[PDB]
Amino acid sequence: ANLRTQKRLAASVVGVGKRKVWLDPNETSEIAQANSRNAIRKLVKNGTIVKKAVTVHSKSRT
């Protein structure tokens, strides 16, 4: 499959960069059918697509 377009849509719908988008590798068939933005929103709701946490930049030593 080719999920390049799904990751681009997921980043825009969620509101983060493509580096913070997680696609479930076990649900490739389901993700491949999500061609619209509404379908992407459903996959975010049920946890098939999730937002990844930001990398910590601690200022404790500062």
Residues at the contact surface with RNA, assessed by CB under 7 A:
1-5, 7-8, 11, 16-25, 28, 35, 52, 54-55, 57, 62
Please state the closest distance from residue 60 (CB atom) to RNA, in A: 11
Residue 53 CB, nearest approach to RNA (Å): 8
Question: Nearer to RNA by C-beta: 8 or 42?
Answer: 8
How would you write the chain as a 3-class SS string? Answer: CCCHHHHHHHHHHHCCCHHHEEECHHHHHHHHCCCCHHHHHHHHHCCCEEECCCCCCCCCCC
